[PDB]
Structure 1
Amino acid sequence: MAHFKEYQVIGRRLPTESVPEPKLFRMRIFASNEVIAKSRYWYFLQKLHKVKKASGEIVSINQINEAHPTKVKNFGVWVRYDSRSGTHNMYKEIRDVSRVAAVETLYQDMAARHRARFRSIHILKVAEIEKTADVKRQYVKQFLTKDLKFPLPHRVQKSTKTFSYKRPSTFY
C-alpha cells in the first residue's frame, strides 16, 4: 500500500462474565499505518478464530523496528496469493537490510511478476536465513560469493539542460 512499517497487534476477543481474561492473540502485520495495521489484524483474525472487531478489542499496537537495520540479510518469505484462477503458496528470497524493506520489495515483485495486488497477498512468514547455503534461490545466491565485484557498464548521465555540446560518453 505504501512504504511499509511492521506492527505487533494484540487483540483480545472482549471479556464476558463466563470468560474473563480472554486469550490475547498477537500478529505481526506489515502496513503503512496503524489504521491499516488494525484492519489487517482483524482480517486475519477473522480468518483464524471466531471473532470480529465488534466482538473484540485491540489490546496493543506497537511498531517493531528492525533490530539491525544496517546489516544486509537474506530473507526467506513465504506468501500465499490469489492468481486470476486460483490460490498458490510461494517461497521467495529477498536480500535487504530490514524486514520492512524486504516486504516492500516482495510486494513490488509480486505485483510485477504475478500481477498480484496487495489485497490478493498474504505474508505467511518472513525469516532471516541465518546460514548461507540455506539460501536456495540463485538470484540471491549469486550475491553471496566471495569478493563479489561487478562493473556498471553503459552509464547514462541525466542532463540538466536540453542541449549538450559534447556528444556524451557512457564510460564508468
Structure 2
Amino acid sequence: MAHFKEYQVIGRRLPTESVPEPKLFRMRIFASNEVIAKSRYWYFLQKLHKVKKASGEIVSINQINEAHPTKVKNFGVWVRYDSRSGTHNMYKEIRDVSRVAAVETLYQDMAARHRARFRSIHILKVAEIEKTADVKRQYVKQFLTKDLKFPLPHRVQKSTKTFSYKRPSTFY
C-alpha cells in the first residue's frame, strides 16, 4: 500500500486464570506503518488461530532492518493470491538489496501482471536463495552470468526547455 517496512509483531491471546502466560505468536509483516502491521497481524492470526484483537494483545512490534542492505540478493518469494475466479499459489524470484525492496517489487509485479491488489495477496514466504544455480527463473538467472555487461541503447534525455535548437541524439 506504500513503501514497505518489515515488522516483527508478537501477540498473546490474552491471559486468564486458566491459562497464564499464553503462547506468544510471532509474525513478519510487510507493511508501510505499524498500524497496518498490527492490522495485518490480527488478520493472519484470525486466519490461523481462535483469537481476535479483542481477545488478544500485541505483545511487541519491532521493525526489522535488512542485515546487509547493500549486497545484491536473489529472493524466492512464495505468495498466495485471489484472482477474479479463484485462489492460486505462486513462486517468483526478485533480485534486490533488501526484503522490503523485494516485497515492493513483488506487489508492483502482482498488480501489473495479475491485477492483484494488496488486499488480494498473502506473502507466504520470502527467503534469500543463498546458492546460485538454485535460481529457477530465467529472468533472474540471466543477470547472474559472469562479467555481465549490457548497453543502454536509445538514450532519451529530457529537455528542461520547450524548444531545442539541435535535433538531438540518442547515443549512449
TM-score (norm 1): 1.00
Q: What SS does the corresponding residue of 2:100 show, helix, strand or coil?
A: helix
Q: CA deviation at 1:167?
A: 0.2
Give the Cα separation in 1 of the matches to 2:52 and 2:16. Answer: 15
1:131 offset after TM fit, Å?
Answer: 0.1
Structure 1 residue 123 displacement after superposition: 0.1
Q: After superposition, give the CA deviation of every residue in 1:18-46 in whole Å (9 maximum; x if it has no partner).
A: 00000000000000000000000000000
Name structure 2 gaps, 5 residues minimum: none
Shift of 1:59: 0.1
Counterpart Cα distance in 1 of 2:38 and 2:112? 27
1:139 is aligned to 2:139: yes
What's the CA shift string for 1:60-97, capped at 9, x where partnerless? 00000000000000000000000000000000000000
Paired residue secondary structure (1:170):
coil
With normalisation by structure 2, the TM-score equals 1.00
Q: CA deviation at 1:171?
A: 0.1
Q: By how many angstroms is 1:156 displaced?
A: 0.1
Q: CA–CA distance in 2 between the matches of 1:53 and 1:20?
A: 18
- The CA deviation at 1:10 is 0.1
* Number of equivalenced pairs: 172
In 2, the alpha carbon distance for the partners of 1:14 and 1:54 equals: 9
Identity %: 100
Root mean square deviation of aligned Cα: 0.1
Q: How many Å separate the matches in 1 of 2:127 and 2:135? A: 11
- Where structure 1 has 5 or more consecutive residues not aligned to the other structure, the ranges are none
Which secondary structure state, in structure 2, belongs to the residue aligned with residue 158 of structure 1?
A: coil
CA distance in 2, matches of 1:94, 1:9: 24
| Distance in structure 2 (CA, Å) of the matches to 1:51 and 1:33 | 23
How many angstroms apart in 1 are the aligned matches of 2:127 and 2:166?
Answer: 50
